[PDB]
Amino acid sequence: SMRICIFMARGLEGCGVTKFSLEQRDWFIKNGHEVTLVYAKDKSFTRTSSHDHKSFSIPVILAKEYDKALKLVNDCDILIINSVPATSVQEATINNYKKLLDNIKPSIRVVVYQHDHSVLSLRRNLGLEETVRRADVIFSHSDNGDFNKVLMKEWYPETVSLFDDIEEAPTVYNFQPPMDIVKVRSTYWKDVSEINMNINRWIGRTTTWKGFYQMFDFHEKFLKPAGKSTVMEGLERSPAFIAIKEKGIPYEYYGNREIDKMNLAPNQPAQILDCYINSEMLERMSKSGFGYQLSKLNQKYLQRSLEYTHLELGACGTIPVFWKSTGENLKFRVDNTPLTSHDSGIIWFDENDMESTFERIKELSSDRALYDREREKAYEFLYQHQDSSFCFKEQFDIITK
Numbered sequence: 001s002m003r004i005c006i007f008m009a010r011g012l013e014g015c016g017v018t019k020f021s022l023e024q025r026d027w028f029i030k031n032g033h034e035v036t037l038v039y040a041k042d043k044s045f046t047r048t049s050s051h052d053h054k055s056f057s058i059p060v061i062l063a064k065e066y067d068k069a070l071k072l073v074n075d076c077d078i079l080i081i082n083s084v085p086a087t088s089v090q091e092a093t094i095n096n097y098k099k100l101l102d103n104i105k106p107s108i109r110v111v112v113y114q115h116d117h118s119v120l121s122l123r124r125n126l127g128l129e130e131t132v133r134r135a136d137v138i139f140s141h142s143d144n145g146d147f148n149k150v151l152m153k154e155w156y157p158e159t160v161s162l163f164d165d166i167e168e169a170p171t172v173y174n175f176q177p178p179m180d181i182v183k184v185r186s187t188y189w190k191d192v193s194e195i196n197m198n199i200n201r202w203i204g205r206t207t208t209w210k211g212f213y214q215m216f217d218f219h220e221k222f223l224k225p226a227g228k229s230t231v232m233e234g235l236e237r238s239p240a241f242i243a244i245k246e247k248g249i250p251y252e253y254y255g256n257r258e259i260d261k262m263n264l265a266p267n268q269p270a271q272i273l274d275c276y277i278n279s280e281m282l283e284r285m286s287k288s289g290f291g292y293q294l295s296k297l298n299q300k301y302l303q304r305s306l307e308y309t310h311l312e313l314g315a316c317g318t319i320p321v322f323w324k325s326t327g328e329n330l331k332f333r334v335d336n337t338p339l340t341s342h343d344s345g346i347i348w349f350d351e352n353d354m355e356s357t358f359e360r361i362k363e364l365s366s367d368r369a370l371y372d373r374e375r376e377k378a379y380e381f382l383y384q385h386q387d388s389s390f391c392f393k394e395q396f397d398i399i400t401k
């Protein structure tokens, strides 16, 4: 048994990094290790309450509580850094973060996980290079991602000066963001009779690669005309969101305090929720006929990692509807074959044949027995692919190598 310190130096954002950090903590504790979850409070975020953590998470102001921060990070055997300060923090924040890295006990094994994809996101970081150089173990979502192919080669140039050193780049291991899929099912799974087959619920946030435009399109072309309802949760307001109205796309927007105002009846525009509490969404999703996760990252960013919203759909008992090309570009953890090559119960949304996609949805909607068989397959498939029991063990073995 060891002491683990999970550190989110960017702060607790409430999305995938936070989710990963919490699932990571759960796995370590479940496996007999001691864990402290620490996050920089210097920068605040909108979804800090999306996940349950307040009863154990340890906030620290890097710019003003360096001593506190240092004592925390040096009180472990393994330090896991899941995020670094954002480009908008004050000098004291980033300066003290860099000082932390330099003063971490040399004997402590520092593990760095790069949870983001595009360079756009990656460059919005401060001190990532210094973090990578101190790391004893580095993880990324793809061998061909921007982190591996752009930043790493930039920090470790394949062409040195003259009086410097060649310094080979450190090894970067692939990883999948795990979730205790069994735990979610044991808490939210509903009997098929409790599910409203006419509800189509998309979950994510306002970033175009999450595929929200495709959901609006699918609602307009097939779901709305068929008398079905569409709900989209997690779309925060921002310049990207403003583009929706500018394009003339109809929708009704709500906050949690007005969720009871959502019109879930036929012939309505997409109903949008600005932000969601994870547990509340899982409850709503478990009673929804079909869940949608239409992320469409470029192939370079895809290896084996599905996202948490992908896993949540299968885990809570709805029928998962995923972006076809993503399934084609991802490989099954078990045998390394495309996710689409399996009879998984997952409906692979095809933008080039949405008619076929909706036909399958109507088929499952009309036969509760079939519906049940299909989601049991999806649950098992996703469990085999990315449950914490498998993935965190794989990562633990790599970390302790």
Ligand SMILES: O=c1ccn([C@@H]2O[C@H](COP(=O)(O)OP(=O)(O)O)[C@@H](O)[C@H]2O)c(=O)[nH]1
Pocket (backbone or CB within 6 Å): 014, 015, 016, 017, 019, 047, 050, 051, 177, 203, 204, 205, 233, 234, 274, 275, 276, 277, 278, 307, 308, 309, 310, 312
């Ligand atoms: O308003 C929101 C938006 C997202 N999430 C959760 O935050 C995580 C997001 O991780 P994912 O890997 O799906 O994508 P990311 O946000 O990290 O790119 C998932 O557990 C979502 O259910 C949430 O609880 N509330």
Ligand SMILES: [Cl-]
Pocket (backbone or CB within 6 Å): 012, 013, 014, 015, 016, 017, 018, 019
């Ligand atoms: Cl996050």
